[PDB]
Amino acid sequence: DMLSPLGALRLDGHFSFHDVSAMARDFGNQCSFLPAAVLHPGSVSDIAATVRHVFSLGEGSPLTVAARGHGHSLMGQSQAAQGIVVRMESLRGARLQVHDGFVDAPGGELWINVLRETLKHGLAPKSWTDYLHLTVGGTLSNAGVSGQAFRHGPQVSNVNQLEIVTGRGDVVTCSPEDNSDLFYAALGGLGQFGIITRARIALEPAPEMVRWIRVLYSDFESFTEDQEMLIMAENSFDYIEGFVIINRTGILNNWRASFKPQDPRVLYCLELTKNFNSGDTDTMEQEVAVLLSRLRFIQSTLFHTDVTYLEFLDRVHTSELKLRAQSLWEVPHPWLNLLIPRSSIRRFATEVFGRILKDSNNGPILLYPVNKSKWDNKTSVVIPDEEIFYLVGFLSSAPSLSGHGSIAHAMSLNSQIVEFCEEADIGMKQYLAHYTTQEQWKTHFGARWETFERRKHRYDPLAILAPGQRIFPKASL
Numbered sequence: 269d270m271l272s273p274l275g276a277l278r279l280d281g282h283f284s285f286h287d288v289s290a291m292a293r294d295f296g297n298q299c300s301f302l303p304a305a306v307l308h309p310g311s312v313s314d315i316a317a318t319v320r321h322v323f324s325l326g327e328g329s330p331l332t333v334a335a336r337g338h339g340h341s342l343m344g345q346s347q348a349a350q351g352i353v354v355r356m357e358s359l360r361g362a363r364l365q366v367h368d369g370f371v372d373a374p375g376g377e378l379w380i381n382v383l384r385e386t387l388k389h390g391l392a393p394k395s396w397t398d399y400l401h402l403t404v405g406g407t408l409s410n411a412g413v414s415g416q417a418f419r420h421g422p423q424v425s426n427v428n429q430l431e432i433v434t435g436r437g438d439v440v441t442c443s444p445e446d447n448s449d450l451f452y453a454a455l456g457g458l459g460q461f462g463i464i465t466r467a468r469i470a471l472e473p474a475p476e477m478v479r480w481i482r483v484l485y486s487d488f489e490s491f492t493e494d495q496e497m498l499i500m501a502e503n504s505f506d507y508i509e510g511f512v513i514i515n516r517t518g519i520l521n522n523w524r525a526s527f528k529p530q531d532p533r534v535l536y537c538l539e540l541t542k543n544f545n546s547g548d549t550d551t552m553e554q555e556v557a558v559l560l561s562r563l564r565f566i567q568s569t570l571f572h573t574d575v576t577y578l579e580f581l582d583r584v585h586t587s588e589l590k591l592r593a594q595s596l597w598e599v600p601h602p603w604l605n606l607l608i609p610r611s612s613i614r615r616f617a618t619e620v621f622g623r624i625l626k627d628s629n630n631g632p633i634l635l636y637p638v639n640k641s642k643w644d645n646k647t648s649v650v651i652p653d654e655e656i657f658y659l660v661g662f663l664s665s666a667p668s669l670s671g672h673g674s675i676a677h678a679m680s681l682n683s684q685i686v687e688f689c690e691e692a693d694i695g696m697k698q699y700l701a702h703y704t705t706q707e708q709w710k711t712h713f714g715a716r717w718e719t720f721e722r723r724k725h726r727y728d729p730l731a732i733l734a735p736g737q738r739i740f741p742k743a744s745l
């Protein structure tokens with residue numbers, strides 16, 4: 269019995285060794301791996317003691333440790349088959365401090381909760397994810413990208429300090445100035461080098477309102493050229509995203525329920541915001557008029573709405589409530605998330621949207637560019653080698669057991685896109701990747717593999733951490 273000395277640890281919290289089903293599923297709703305135990309930590313010391321114990325067993329133990337955030341992983345990345353799942357949200361509380369234009373947040377804290385606290389001081393983080401009900405540790409283990417990344421970089425570019433429990437069970441406080449290799453390793457590190465128990469996030473003064481804008485384009489070339497010009501301009505919009513709309517009719521009528529019209533085939537939606545304060549509405553109106561005057565969208569499709577900063581940032585939670593009401597939230601999510609270099613974007617769009625795809629009815633297609641200069645080259649993040657690259661997110665649901673959608677249909681369409689990228693040398697890199705072999709991961713990492721592998725031996729030599737990533741099998745190094 270390897271799990272009886274685990275039950276002998278004098279934890280601040282406790283272990284669950286039978287009631288473990290909730291930790292054997294994720295948002296992907298496809299993979300289910302029953303863990304042997306679930307740690308509900310009462311402190312970071314509990315996490316460190318659990319990791320130290322597993323490490324003390326050496327190479328003769330199949331025990332693994334997976335930190336679970338909000339479980340938004342799509343293919344078992346936060347699960348541990350016959351291992352130990354650490355419920356990071358058990359430490360949410362509790363150690364949330366705002367000081368000096370920074371917020372110190374537990375790793376298991378949701379971004380929505382970081383924002384609610386921070387707003388009480390008139391402050392907020394600068395860089396977001398589209399959905400806020402995700403943990404600080406979970407999004408930083410990836411990158412955390414939204415409409416602000418073009419300017420502030422991803423969330424991983426807006427963190428100043430991390431408190432980590434390494435795969436050796438050591439508790440380390442790190443930053444660009446102390447234990448910097450661990451700091452940079454953890455950022456986009458896919459949970460490979462340790463568990464982030466606390467993060468210092470940079471803040472900026474928060475606006476009270478946002479002018480939220482949506483416009484349509486018929487031409488991809490003009491759509492993307494306008495996005496690229498907006499991401500390079502000075503005093504531009506505060507959020508820049510885009511959507512690919514395949515076949516769908518009554519798009520302006522769907523917007524009419526929330527947005528004010530001004531005035532009443534593959535289409536492209538450009539989504540923008542301009543941050544503002546009530547006492548400075550006229551300056552915003554003038555600045556927005558100027559910015560829009562340089563764009564080439566279909567004028568009759570201009571829709572806008574004035575909302576609070578919180579209402580805009582938490583917008584996806586409204587869609588979550590509607591899906592939960594229709595029992596459409598916990599369905600399989602066979603998402604495909606790609607990073608496409610600027611030089612390949614048109615060739616990609618021609619084949620993917622013009623040929624491979626017939627409709628976009630089972631989920632949105634995100635498409636927008638970012639600036640590579642905002643991403644630090646020392647992290648574990650994998651990005652294309654061009655100064656401008658695009659995030660392309662195929663955020664599909666599979667509500668059907670057969671036919672149109674249908675995990676088998678979504679999976680076939682995803683394979684076709686990836687096979688095209690490979691055959692036509694697009695230079696694509698996947699975001700939120702789910703490779704099953706170390707050979708597929710070596711190719712993904714490419715020139716950055718050696719760095720990733722050396723950091724792994726340094727911080728998790730026995731490969732105890734985040735086995736669901738499938739990069740390093742237990743004790744394989």
Ligand SMILES: *Cc1cc2c(cc1C)nc1c(=O)[nH]c(=O)nc-1n2C[C@H](O)[C@H](O)[C@H](O)COP(=O)(O)OP(=O)(O)OC[C@H]1O[C@@H](n2cnc3c(N)ncnc32)[C@H](O)[C@@H]1O
Binds near residue numbers: 335340375411412
């Ligand atoms: C479900 C979802 C995801 C999502 C999104 C919208 C929805 C509805 N919108 C995103 C967006 O606009 N931009 C973006 O960059 N990502 C977006 N995502 C994906 C999301 O960021 C990720 O799924 C991410 O993993 C964060 O979510 P979460 O907190 O749910 O974390 P997890 O899924 O349980 O675990 C992720 C991996 O990291 C390891 N892990 C978890 N917590 C930690 C800590 N504290 N320290 C170290 N590693 C940790 C897990 O073991 C797993 O491998």
